[PDB]
Amino acid sequence: GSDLPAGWMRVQDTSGTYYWHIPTGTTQWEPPGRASP
Protein backbone atom coordinates (compact mmCIF):
# COMPACT_ATOMS: atom_id res chain seq x y z
CA GLY A 1 0.00 0.00 0.00
CA SER A 2 -1.19 2.62 -0.63
CA ASP A 3 -3.56 2.24 -3.56
CA LEU A 4 -5.52 5.36 -2.59
CA PRO A 5 -5.05 8.85 -3.93
CA ALA A 6 -4.29 11.54 -1.38
CA GLY A 7 -7.37 12.67 0.47
CA TRP A 8 -9.00 9.24 0.64
CA MET A 9 -9.13 6.76 3.47
CA ARG A 10 -10.76 3.41 4.01
CA VAL A 11 -13.42 3.23 6.74
CA GLN A 12 -14.44 0.05 8.55
CA ASP A 13 -18.06 -0.88 8.99
CA THR A 14 -19.82 -4.13 9.88
CA SER A 15 -21.19 -4.09 6.32
CA GLY A 16 -17.82 -3.66 4.65
CA THR A 17 -15.05 -1.17 3.95
CA TYR A 18 -16.05 2.11 2.31
CA TYR A 19 -14.04 5.00 0.98
CA TRP A 20 -14.12 8.48 2.38
CA HIS A 21 -12.69 11.57 0.62
CA ILE A 22 -12.05 13.84 3.60
CA PRO A 23 -11.81 17.19 1.78
CA THR A 24 -15.22 16.90 0.11
CA GLY A 25 -17.10 14.52 2.43
CA THR A 26 -17.66 12.09 -0.44
CA THR A 27 -18.30 8.45 0.59
CA GLN A 28 -18.62 5.49 -1.74
CA TRP A 29 -18.27 1.71 -1.85
CA GLU A 30 -16.10 1.55 -4.98
CA PRO A 31 -12.37 2.07 -4.63
CA PRO A 32 -11.38 5.50 -5.94
CA GLY A 33 -11.40 6.84 -8.48
CA ARG A 34 -9.54 10.20 -8.14
CA ALA A 35 -6.59 10.22 -8.33
CA SER A 36 -3.85 9.61 -8.73
CA PRO A 37 -3.58 6.51 -6.50
Binding site: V11, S15, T27
Partner: peptide, 9 residues
Protein backbone atom coordinates in the same frame (compact mmCIF):
# COMPACT_ATOMS: atom_id res chain seq x y z
CA UNK B 1 -16.04 9.37 9.93
CA UNK B 2 -19.38 9.85 8.16
CA UNK B 3 -21.72 6.86 8.11
CA UNK B 4 -21.58 4.12 5.53
CA UNK B 5 -23.08 5.24 2.25
CA UNK B 6 -26.16 3.59 0.69
CA UNK B 7 -25.70 1.05 -2.03
CA UNK B 8 -26.03 2.50 -5.46
CA UNK B 9 -28.95 1.34 -7.67
Amino acid sequence: PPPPPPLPP
